[model samples]
Target: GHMGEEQYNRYQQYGAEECVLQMGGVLCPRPGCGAGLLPEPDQRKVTCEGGNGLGCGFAFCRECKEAYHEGECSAVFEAS
Candidate 1:
């Protein structure tokens, strides 16, 4: 299911207004992976494998995180 504009706006408000900035380059929660998170103004999301896929709780930079949080754009999957 896709999120509506209202939900997207709320996310933007929360990130732009409420959340605080932390460190950078946090590793993706996916095991055995060394992909550093992209910078801000990007996007974020969770990936679920059918049965054996790992649940990686990865984080992005302030900008990327914010973009993802705000749903300013489509999911990276779509873009790719």
Candidate 2:
């Protein structure tokens, strides 16, 4: 387990590339802050760091790909 952080960085790039090529990458649902999510495979939720290096702490579902509203799927949507 003596591998340097270099490998981690390299692999990170690879994952990002794949995500972009596929789903156009995990984008922040927030307007204008759609930064590429650091692809976390096997992770059900993706955390969106806010704009300009500051995250709004938005963790969203990778499946439905919406902002995590911290409740049942039925409660996160409209019809309020």
Best model per TM-score: 2
Per-model TM against the reference: 0.23, 0.44
How good is model 1 by TM-score?
0.23
lDDT of 2 by residue, 13-75 (tens): 543433423332577767877667664663356667634674667577654466554565422
Candidate 1 per-residue C-alpha lDDT over 1-80 given as tens digits, one digit per residue, 9 for 90 to 100: 69645323446554454344443444443457544544433234432221233324434334332223545333343432
Off by over 4 Å in 1: 1-23, 42-80
TM-score of model 2 (CA atoms): 0.44
Q: In candidate 2, which residue pairs clash?
A: 49-55, 50-55, 50-56
Report the lDDT of model 2 for residue 68. Answer: 53
Residue 49 in model 2: lDDT:
65
